[model samples]
Target: MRDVVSFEQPEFSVSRGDQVARIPVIRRVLDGGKSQVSYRTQDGTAQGNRDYIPVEGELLFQPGEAWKELQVKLLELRQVRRFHVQLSNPKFGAHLGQPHSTTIIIRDP
Candidate 1:
């Protein structure tokens, strides 16, 4: 399969001063044995381990599975913090889509 995997472009919103947020990443093509990929959170306007919990790990998809979620802890802050959700290291002949990184904005309430 020569298809590419990537994150959806739609923005995610979370209440300001919230404890955490969950972001959903959808895989474009879900057909194969244990498709694997790695991802990490990058600092934007937000600082890692301070504004939001830093997440760096690999994801494994079972056959027929199409999506997964990344959990990030949001520190209570007044300024709207921003970060990037980046995907990499796709296996089983899968590659990342154009603009492989997605911007995630943590909104202030």
Candidate 2:
């Protein structure tokens, strides 16, 4: 069977002044071979530049690696904001799992 990969959880909340949001990504069963996955940021209630900087990148998992983190830099603000970071394009005999999209909440500090 193929390996399964997805977000560790669905939502994350952080203070406005916090540096960044480290989203956890997990893999089910670590057999062998490196895996590659793609990630991209999108606006929810928060728009890019206004609330946070948009980012896109790929995560590389070494053989037997079970977990990785995707960091989304947060903007300093006075009010709350919302956004999402999604995982897509699973490669090397791996498939996406549930809650592939994670909602990030930036609360007032």
Candidate 3:
């Protein structure tokens, strides 16, 4: 059988839009469990800025049965602000290599 799996990205927006604050705060829409990468970029030490990973996607689930399991994982990995799921293409792990990788940003809570 083919290995079927699903993933999601969360919708996030600036909580304090264009307002100076002690720390950057973002408001995220609970997507149930769906999101897409809006944009990604590495940190620039010279520029003196923290790394930012912007992912955007609606909250939808697949293989609904996996919902419970997914929730468990999410709970275990508490403090999950954002993340990217790597996808496997080959059947039954035929192609052993890097599965696709997406990025998510989590905050220090």
Candidate 4:
């Protein structure tokens, strides 16, 4: 059987003026070659450029590596905002686990 990859789906809230927030993506079992995966963030209640800068990139896990973080740079604001982060285009012998997408909420300071 093959292992699976999943995101830690927990609601994250940050103050309006916060500088950075890091969200983690994890793999159930890190027992193979390097796992390469791609992911991007989408605007939900949160609009990119206004509330937060959009992020799109690839994460690579070395052999036996189990986790990686997605960094979100928050912008200064007075109202709350939110966004969705998801995985796609996996490579190097890996698969998406349950709950592939996660919602992130940013609260006002």
Taking all chains together, the TM-score of candidate 4 against the true structure is 0.89
- Model 1: weakest 10-residue lDDT segment is 1-10
Runs off by more than 4 Å, candidate 2: none
Clashes of each: 0, 0, 9, 0
Error of 4 at 101 (Å): 0.8
Model 2, 24-100: lDDT tens per residue? Answer: 99988766888878989999988788778899998888888899887777776557778999989988877788888
Candidate 1 residue-wise lDDT, 1-109, digit = tens: 4345667664677765667777777666554656777899889988886788888998777777777787888876456768888889988766677556777788777
What are the runs in model 4 whose C-alpha is more than 4 Å off? none
TM-score of each: 0.83, 0.91, 0.23, 0.89
RMSD of 4: 1.7
Q: Write the per-residue lDDT of candidate 3 for residues 9-72, one digit (tens) a residue.
A: 3322222122211211111323233322211222222111222322222222222222211110
List where candidate 1 sits over 4 angstroms from the true fold: 1-3
Better model by TM-score, 1 or 3? 1
Regarding lDDT, does 2 or 4 come out ahead?
2
By lDDT: ranked, best first = 2, 4, 1, 3
Model 3 residue 44 lDDT score? 24
Please name the candidate that would achieve the greatest TM-score relative to the true structure. Answer: 2
TM-score of 3: 0.23
